[PDB]
Every structure is written in C-alpha cells, then in structure tokens.
Amino acid sequence: FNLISEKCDILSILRDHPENRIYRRKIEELSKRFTAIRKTKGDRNCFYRALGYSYLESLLGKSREIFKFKERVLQTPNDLLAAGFEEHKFRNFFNAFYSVVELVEKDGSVSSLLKVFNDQSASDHIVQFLRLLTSAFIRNRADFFRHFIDEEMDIKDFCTHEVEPMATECDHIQITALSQALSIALQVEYVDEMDTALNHHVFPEAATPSVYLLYKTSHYNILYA
Ligand SMILES: *CC(=O)/N=C/c1ccc(C)cc1
Question: Given the CA of residue 40, which atom of ligand 1 is nearest to it?
C-alpha cells in the first residue's frame, strides 16, 4: 500500500502537523463533513493516481455507469490520434487503462483495484495514459484554453513540459482538462496554513461530485463523504 494507502479516520492526519493551530482547526472542521481518508505517495504523479483510483472505485457494482464509461474509454484513441500521438507509441498505456476498467466490471472488488494501483508498473502505465489524454484534450481545444484560461500562454510548449512527462505537477488547467476528457465530476478541498476559511472548488462548476480530494502541502489525498 506504498502508492495508495488503506482507509484511515480523518483525524489521523493531525499527527502530520503536530502543534500547528491553523492545520488543527481546518482538519477538525474537515472531520465534520468527511469520515475517512486515503493517502497517496508524493512523487509528482499523485493528482493523476488519486483521481484514477477514486473514480474507478466509485464505479464498483454500478452496471449502467460502467457500461457508459467503457464506451467513452473505447473512443479515447481517437482523441490521441487527432492531437498527433501515434498508435504504436500510446498502445501500451491505453491497453493498461482499458484492462483496469474491465477489472472494475469483471472482478468488482476494492482489494483487486487497490492491488493494481499499488503495482508500480501497472499504476505508472495508468498514470502515463491519463497524462497523454490530458495533453490530447488541451491540444484539440487550444482556443478554449487560451480564451478562458490565458490568452498569452503557449499551449504546445505547456503540454510538452508540464503535462506529458512523468512527475510534473498539475494546476487548474490539467484538473479541468482531465475532468472534461473522462466526464468525471470532482471536488477539491483546500487546506493551507493561512488563517482563512476551509474552502472547495467543483470541476465542472455545476456538478454533483463522484470524487472528493484534499489538497494539502502540494499533495492530493482521497476523501470519503
Ligand atoms: C501530487 C504529488 O505527487 N505531489 C508531490 C509533492 C509533494 C510536496 C511538494 C513540495 C511537491 C510535490
């Protein structure tokens, strides 16, 4: 369980910030709204790894939602090809993501899903697939990211340097892009060391979330409502 942990009580993370007034206040508040947490390894891949695991976990036992997600995943090779990725270079990463989706359908257990995401090889193939898909979806919608995010940014250089490579950190653009690319509704809770309100953002704005993440000390952990 070195990449994604077992579930722990929310108040168990007080020990990560001992004798810190502001962290203690916000974790106590968070505990009023959430019951449990899973921790992720802080290796620069934790956003992709957390979102991937938590979203597939939320599908277990839901036969219609699994059918619809499988249908979308089968079309993602077309997104990658439209953005200029070559099939023989994405094949190994697509095949690893499709395999874990069939595992959700066929096997249906938390234990089996958690083993794949703690297997360094399988888990890293999954993360690399999610990074390529994020890149593709941004590149195919460059005017949308320029219009609504940043009219001055260089989209192709940004994807090359800050999306595709393993261990590169995320920002709002990557979160928005992967959310839209797989139709995943997610809520991020923010815990920083300023004397401010505990606050959250939902991606996309309207939505009812599937997934809850805690962003704290540059790190994304998984929350349970
Ligand atoms: C999301 C992820 O893997 N974060 C890792 C991390 C932890 C701490 C710092 C300072 C940078 C990156």
Answer: 3
